Coordinates of C-alpha atoms and ligand atoms in Angstrom, one line a residue:
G164 CA 0.0 0.0 0.0
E165 CA 3.0 2.3 0.4
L166 CA 4.2 4.5 -2.4
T167 CA 7.6 5.3 -0.8
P168 CA 8.9 3.6 2.3
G169 CA 6.5 4.5 5.1
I170 CA 4.1 6.8 3.2
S171 CA 1.0 5.6 1.4
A172 CA -0.2 7.0 -1.9
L173 CA -3.2 8.4 0.0
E174 CA -1.1 10.7 2.1
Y175 CA 0.6 12.1 -1.0
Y176 CA -2.8 12.9 -2.4
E177 CA -3.8 14.5 1.0
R178 CA -0.6 16.6 0.9
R179 CA -1.5 18.0 -2.6
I180 CA -5.0 18.7 -1.3
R181 CA -3.7 20.6 1.7
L182 CA -1.6 22.8 -0.6
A183 CA -4.5 23.4 -2.9
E184 CA -6.6 24.5 0.0
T185 CA -4.3 27.5 0.2
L186 CA -4.4 28.6 -3.4
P187 CA -6.7 31.1 -5.2
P188 CA -8.7 30.1 -8.2
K189 CA -6.7 29.8 -11.5
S190 CA -3.4 29.1 -9.8
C191 CA -0.7 26.6 -10.8
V192 CA 2.3 25.4 -8.8
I193 CA 5.4 24.5 -10.8
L194 CA 8.2 22.3 -9.3
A195 CA 11.3 21.3 -11.2
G196 CA 13.0 18.1 -10.2
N197 CA 16.8 17.5 -10.0
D198 CA 19.1 16.0 -12.6
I199 CA 21.8 13.4 -12.3
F200 CA 20.2 10.6 -6.8
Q201 CA 18.7 13.3 -4.6
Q202 CA 15.2 14.4 -5.8
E203 CA 13.9 17.9 -5.1
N204 CA 12.3 17.4 -1.7
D205 CA 9.3 19.8 -2.3
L206 CA 8.5 17.8 -5.4
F207 CA 9.2 14.5 -3.4
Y208 CA 7.0 15.6 -0.5
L209 CA 4.0 15.9 -2.9
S210 CA 4.6 13.1 -5.4
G211 CA 7.0 10.5 -4.1
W212 CA 8.5 10.7 -7.6
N213 CA 12.2 10.0 -7.4
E214 CA 13.5 10.2 -11.0
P215 CA 15.6 12.9 -12.7
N216 CA 14.5 15.2 -15.5
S217 CA 10.9 15.6 -14.3
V218 CA 8.5 18.5 -13.8
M219 CA 5.4 18.5 -11.6
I220 CA 2.5 20.9 -12.0
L221 CA -0.4 21.3 -9.5
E222 CA -3.2 23.4 -11.0
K223 CA -6.4 24.8 -9.3
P224 CA -8.7 26.0 -12.1
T225 CA -11.7 26.9 -10.0
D226 CA -12.4 27.3 -6.2
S227 CA -13.5 23.6 -6.0
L228 CA -11.0 21.1 -4.7
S229 CA -12.5 18.4 -7.0
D230 CA -11.3 20.3 -10.1
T231 CA -7.5 20.3 -9.3
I232 CA -5.2 18.7 -11.8
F233 CA -1.9 16.9 -11.0
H234 CA 0.4 17.1 -14.0
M235 CA 3.6 15.1 -14.3
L236 CA 6.2 15.3 -17.1
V237 CA 8.6 12.5 -16.9
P238 CA 11.4 10.9 -19.0
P239 CA 10.0 8.5 -21.7
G240 CA 2.5 4.0 -14.9
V241 CA 3.0 7.5 -13.5
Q242 CA -0.8 8.0 -13.6
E243 CA -1.5 4.5 -12.2
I244 CA 1.2 4.3 -9.4
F245 CA 1.7 8.0 -8.6
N246 CA -1.8 9.1 -9.3
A247 CA -1.0 11.8 -11.9
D248 CA -4.2 13.2 -13.4
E249 CA -2.3 14.2 -16.6
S250 CA 1.1 13.2 -17.9
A251 CA 3.4 13.6 -20.9
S252 CA 7.0 13.2 -22.0
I253 CA 9.5 15.7 -20.6
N254 CA 10.4 16.6 -24.2
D255 CA 6.9 18.1 -24.6
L256 CA 7.7 20.7 -21.9
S257 CA 8.0 23.6 -24.4
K258 CA 4.6 22.7 -25.9
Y259 CA 2.9 21.5 -22.7
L260 CA 3.8 24.1 -20.1
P261 CA 2.8 27.4 -21.8
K262 CA -0.8 26.2 -22.4
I263 CA -1.1 25.8 -18.6
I264 CA 0.6 29.1 -17.7
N265 CA -1.6 31.1 -20.0
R266 CA -4.9 29.9 -18.5
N267 CA -3.9 30.8 -14.9
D268 CA -3.4 34.2 -13.2
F269 CA -1.1 33.1 -10.4
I270 CA 2.1 31.2 -11.1
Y271 CA 3.6 29.6 -7.9
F272 CA 7.3 29.2 -8.8
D273 CA 10.6 30.1 -7.2
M274 CA 12.7 32.2 -9.5
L275 CA 15.9 31.6 -7.5
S276 CA 20.7 24.5 -10.7
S277 CA 18.4 22.1 -12.4
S278 CA 18.2 22.0 -16.2
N279 CA 14.4 22.1 -16.3
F280 CA 14.6 25.0 -13.8
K281 CA 16.5 27.2 -16.1
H282 CA 14.2 26.2 -18.9
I283 CA 11.0 27.1 -17.0
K284 CA 12.5 30.3 -15.6
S285 CA 13.3 31.6 -19.1
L286 CA 9.7 31.1 -20.1
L287 CA 8.9 33.6 -17.3
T288 CA 2.1 37.4 -11.1
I289 CA 4.9 35.0 -9.9
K290 CA 4.7 34.0 -6.3
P291 CA 7.2 31.9 -4.4
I292 CA 6.1 28.5 -3.1
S293 CA 9.0 26.7 -1.4
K294 CA 8.3 28.4 1.9
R295 CA 4.6 27.6 1.9
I296 CA 5.4 23.9 1.5
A297 CA 8.0 24.3 4.2
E298 CA 5.2 25.3 6.6
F299 CA 3.6 21.9 5.8
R300 CA 6.9 19.9 5.9
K301 CA 7.8 21.2 9.4
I302 CA 4.7 19.4 10.8
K303 CA 5.2 15.6 10.4
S304 CA 2.3 13.2 10.1
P305 CA 2.0 10.1 12.2
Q306 CA 3.3 8.0 9.3
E307 CA 6.3 10.3 8.9
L308 CA 7.0 10.2 12.6
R309 CA 6.9 6.4 12.3
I310 CA 9.3 6.2 9.4
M311 CA 11.7 8.7 11.1
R312 CA 11.5 6.6 14.3
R313 CA 12.5 3.6 12.2
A314 CA 15.5 5.4 10.8
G315 CA 16.6 6.6 14.2
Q316 CA 16.1 3.2 15.7
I317 CA 18.2 1.5 13.0
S318 CA 20.9 4.2 13.4
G319 CA 20.7 3.9 17.2
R320 CA 21.2 0.1 17.3
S321 CA 24.1 0.5 14.9
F322 CA 25.9 2.7 17.4
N323 CA 25.4 0.2 20.1
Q324 CA 27.0 -2.5 18.0
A325 CA 29.9 -0.2 17.5
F326 CA 30.2 0.4 21.2
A327 CA 31.1 -3.2 21.8
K328 CA 33.9 -3.3 19.3
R329 CA 37.4 -1.9 19.3
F330 CA 38.5 0.4 16.5
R331 CA 42.2 1.3 15.8
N332 CA 41.4 3.7 13.0
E333 CA 38.6 6.1 12.2
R334 CA 37.9 4.7 8.7
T335 CA 37.1 1.3 10.1
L336 CA 34.6 2.9 12.5
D337 CA 33.2 4.9 9.5
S338 CA 32.7 1.9 7.1
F339 CA 31.3 -0.2 10.0
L340 CA 28.5 2.3 10.8
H341 CA 27.7 2.7 7.1
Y342 CA 27.3 -1.1 6.7
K343 CA 25.1 -1.4 9.8
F344 CA 22.9 1.5 8.6
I345 CA 22.3 -0.2 5.2
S346 CA 22.0 -3.8 6.4
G347 CA 19.8 -2.5 9.2
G348 CA 17.3 -1.3 6.6
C349 CA 18.3 2.2 5.6
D350 CA 18.7 3.5 2.0
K351 CA 21.9 5.6 2.4
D352 CA 23.8 7.9 4.8
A353 CA 21.6 10.8 5.9
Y354 CA 24.7 13.0 5.6
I355 CA 28.5 12.9 5.3
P356 CA 29.6 11.4 8.7
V357 CA 32.0 12.8 11.2
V358 CA 34.4 10.3 12.9
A359 CA 36.8 12.5 15.0
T360 CA 39.1 10.9 17.5
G361 CA 40.9 13.0 20.2
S362 CA 42.0 16.4 19.0
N363 CA 40.2 15.8 15.7
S364 CA 36.9 16.5 17.6
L365 CA 37.9 20.2 17.9
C366 CA 37.3 20.7 14.1
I367 CA 33.5 21.0 13.9
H368 CA 33.6 20.1 10.2
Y369 CA 36.0 17.2 10.3
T370 CA 35.3 14.6 7.6
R371 CA 38.7 13.1 6.6
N372 CA 37.9 10.1 8.8
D373 CA 41.2 8.3 8.4
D374 CA 43.4 9.0 11.5
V375 CA 44.6 6.5 14.0
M376 CA 42.8 6.1 17.3
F377 CA 44.6 5.9 20.6
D378 CA 43.7 4.2 23.9
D379 CA 43.6 7.5 25.9
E380 CA 41.1 9.6 23.9
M381 CA 37.4 9.7 23.1
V382 CA 35.9 9.7 19.6
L383 CA 33.2 12.0 18.4
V384 CA 30.8 10.4 15.8
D385 CA 28.1 12.2 14.0
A386 CA 26.4 9.8 11.6
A387 CA 22.9 8.3 10.9
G388 CA 21.0 6.6 8.1
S389 CA 18.1 7.7 5.9
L390 CA 15.0 5.7 5.0
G391 CA 12.4 6.6 2.4
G392 CA 14.1 10.0 2.1
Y393 CA 13.7 10.8 5.8
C394 CA 16.8 11.5 7.8
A395 CA 18.0 10.7 11.3
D396 CA 20.8 12.6 13.0
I397 CA 22.9 11.1 15.9
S398 CA 26.0 12.3 17.7
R399 CA 27.8 10.2 20.3
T400 CA 31.2 10.5 22.2
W401 CA 32.8 7.6 24.0
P402 CA 36.3 6.6 25.1
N403 CA 38.4 4.4 22.9
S404 CA 39.8 2.4 25.9
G405 CA 36.2 1.5 27.0
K406 CA 36.1 3.3 30.3
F407 CA 35.7 7.0 31.3
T408 CA 38.5 8.6 33.2
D409 CA 37.6 11.1 35.9
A410 CA 38.2 14.0 33.5
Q411 CA 36.4 12.4 30.6
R412 CA 33.5 11.8 33.0
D413 CA 33.2 15.3 34.3
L414 CA 33.2 16.9 30.8
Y415 CA 30.8 14.3 29.3
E416 CA 28.2 14.7 32.1
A417 CA 28.3 18.4 31.5
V418 CA 27.2 18.0 27.9
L419 CA 24.8 15.2 28.9
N420 CA 23.2 17.4 31.6
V421 CA 22.6 20.3 29.1
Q422 CA 21.2 17.9 26.6
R423 CA 18.9 16.1 29.1
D424 CA 17.5 19.4 30.5
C425 CA 16.9 20.7 26.9
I426 CA 15.1 17.5 25.8
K427 CA 12.7 17.8 28.8
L428 CA 11.6 21.2 27.4
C429 CA 10.3 19.8 24.1
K430 CA 6.6 19.9 25.0
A431 CA 4.3 22.0 22.8
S432 CA 2.4 23.3 25.9
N433 CA 5.7 24.9 27.0
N434 CA 5.3 27.3 24.1
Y435 CA 9.1 27.4 23.6
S436 CA 10.6 28.3 20.3
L437 CA 13.7 26.7 18.9
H438 CA 15.6 29.9 19.8
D439 CA 14.1 29.9 23.3
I440 CA 15.6 26.5 23.8
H441 CA 19.0 27.5 22.4
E442 CA 19.3 30.5 24.8
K443 CA 18.4 28.1 27.6
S444 CA 21.1 25.8 26.4
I445 CA 23.6 28.6 26.8
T446 CA 22.5 29.3 30.3
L447 CA 22.6 25.6 31.3
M448 CA 26.1 25.2 29.7
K449 CA 27.4 28.2 31.6
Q450 CA 26.3 26.6 34.9
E451 CA 28.0 23.4 34.0
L452 CA 31.2 25.4 33.1
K453 CA 30.9 27.0 36.5
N454 CA 30.6 23.6 38.2
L455 CA 33.8 22.6 36.5
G456 CA 35.5 25.8 37.5
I457 CA 36.4 26.6 33.9
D458 CA 33.8 29.3 33.1
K459 CA 35.9 32.4 33.8
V460 CA 38.8 31.7 31.4
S461 CA 39.8 34.9 29.7
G462 CA 39.0 35.0 26.0
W463 CA 37.1 31.6 26.2
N464 CA 33.5 32.4 27.2
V465 CA 30.7 29.9 26.7
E466 CA 30.2 31.0 23.1
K467 CA 33.7 30.0 22.2
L468 CA 33.5 26.6 24.0
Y469 CA 29.9 25.9 22.8
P470 CA 30.1 27.6 19.4
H471 CA 27.0 26.3 17.5
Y472 CA 23.3 26.1 17.7
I473 CA 21.3 23.7 19.9
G474 CA 19.7 21.9 17.0
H475 CA 17.6 22.1 13.9
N476 CA 14.4 20.9 12.3
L477 CA 14.7 17.4 10.9
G478 CA 12.9 15.6 8.0
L479 CA 13.5 15.1 4.3
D480 CA 16.6 17.3 4.7
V481 CA 19.1 17.1 7.5
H482 CA 18.7 20.8 8.2
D483 CA 15.0 20.6 7.4
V484 CA 12.7 23.5 6.5
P485 CA 15.3 26.3 6.9
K486 CA 12.9 29.0 5.8
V487 CA 10.6 28.6 8.8
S488 CA 10.9 31.0 11.7
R489 CA 13.3 29.9 14.5
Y490 CA 11.4 32.2 16.8
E491 CA 7.8 31.0 16.7
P492 CA 6.8 28.5 19.4
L493 CA 7.3 24.8 18.6
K494 CA 4.1 23.1 17.4
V495 CA 3.0 19.5 17.7
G496 CA 4.5 17.3 15.0
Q497 CA 7.8 19.1 14.6
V498 CA 11.0 17.1 14.8
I499 CA 14.1 18.9 16.1
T500 CA 17.5 17.8 17.2
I501 CA 19.1 18.6 20.6
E502 CA 22.9 18.6 20.2
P503 CA 24.8 20.7 22.7
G504 CA 28.5 20.4 22.8
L505 CA 31.8 21.3 24.6
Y506 CA 35.1 21.7 22.8
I507 CA 38.1 22.6 25.0
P508 CA 41.1 24.2 23.2
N509 CA 44.7 23.4 23.7
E510 CA 45.5 26.3 25.9
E511 CA 47.5 26.1 29.2
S512 CA 44.9 28.3 30.9
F513 CA 42.7 25.2 31.0
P514 CA 43.5 22.0 33.0
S515 CA 45.8 19.6 31.0
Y516 CA 43.3 16.8 31.3
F517 CA 40.7 18.9 29.5
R518 CA 42.7 20.2 26.5
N519 CA 41.9 18.9 23.0
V520 CA 38.6 17.2 24.2
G521 CA 35.5 17.7 22.1
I522 CA 32.1 16.2 23.0
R523 CA 28.7 16.3 21.4
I524 CA 25.5 14.4 22.2
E525 CA 22.7 14.6 19.6
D526 CA 19.2 13.0 19.7
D527 CA 16.1 13.5 17.5
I528 CA 13.1 14.7 19.5
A529 CA 9.5 14.9 18.2
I530 CA 7.2 17.5 19.8
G531 CA 4.0 16.3 21.5
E532 CA 1.1 18.0 23.2
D533 CA 2.2 17.4 26.8
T534 CA 5.2 15.2 26.2
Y535 CA 7.8 14.3 23.6
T536 CA 9.3 11.2 21.9
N537 CA 13.0 10.3 21.7
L538 CA 13.2 8.9 18.1
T539 CA 16.8 7.8 18.8
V540 CA 16.5 6.5 22.3
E541 CA 18.0 3.1 21.5
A542 CA 21.5 4.5 21.2
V543 CA 22.6 4.5 24.9
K544 CA 24.3 7.6 26.2
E545 CA 24.5 7.3 30.0
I546 CA 28.0 6.6 31.3
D547 CA 26.9 3.5 33.2
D548 CA 25.0 2.3 30.1
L549 CA 28.0 3.2 27.8
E550 CA 30.6 1.5 30.0
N551 CA 28.3 -1.6 30.2
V552 CA 28.0 -2.1 26.4
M553 CA 31.7 -1.3 25.8
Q554 CA 33.1 -3.9 28.3
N555 CA 30.5 -6.6 28.2
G556 CA 28.9 -6.3 24.7
Ligands
MN742 MN1 24.5 15.7 13.6
MN743 MN1 22.2 17.8 13.6

């Protein structure tokens, strides 16, 4: 019954109806797919069509939802499997598209690099559309929450399998997690992974993933799988030796405390915005820095030791729906990550056992009415849970 993994063909139809319920009479939405594979997600959200060199048109000729028309121009079944009301070859674009534009007053199309995009743009009231769909994508349906839970569950269990094994080089740990994501049931990597051991964890954008791992440092890993186009996002940090030292413990619990207290905020009744939570993450991280006695270091305030945001919306993209307001209260159905971090520089003004230690703990949280749902709860992160899996398996 599914059209793409986790989503039925009925929901795709319902998504196109929800968009049409916002359009005036004699409108048409034009979405150009990608070329050679990562489909255009606005197109994928409404069609489930995952092929290159394709154009979708959603047309509302009157004010009745029963008159809408779902056009699909594909490379030379689309009507029977994807429920396209009309279809034609993509070669017919120059003869097919102008007939539709001329009979409509409002053209929903983003004028700002696909080949069919430059084609359609040259043919051209023009209104943007990608942001209006973003307001729909930021609210996940129960089916979408289920398929994301499956992605995070597969990714989470893959981390636990890695916890029980010893890795002498980053690239082995990289290829291992990739295989477990795929054999666990995922389509691909959700994003380019980070496998940073020791001082490598201080580079926020480290992706080389080929350095040797030593028995005295911890490894920071940001990696997760994708299923049906939906992405998970997990970060974990654990010692290579398999046991936390007293220093590695104190720093890890600081990041874990900030993350835990922030996850507890993700209830829609709290009326917090994503930025509201981030500013609370700064406050909490300051207090943890004070508990460790490293908050008042000159030139290294909390912004330089915690130098990124608390998280981001998650969905078809890793950094999902970027065009939605970070300042409006979180609504039921949104999926955001909670990923605070600490990264101590190699400065003698810091204790020696803290220098060159970077830590980040990331989980995917879905917003509920009076609670939340940890979509990545399987990947253990408590020190006693971590040390148990590492030494016993
Ligand atoms: Mn991440
Ligand atoms: Mn993230």
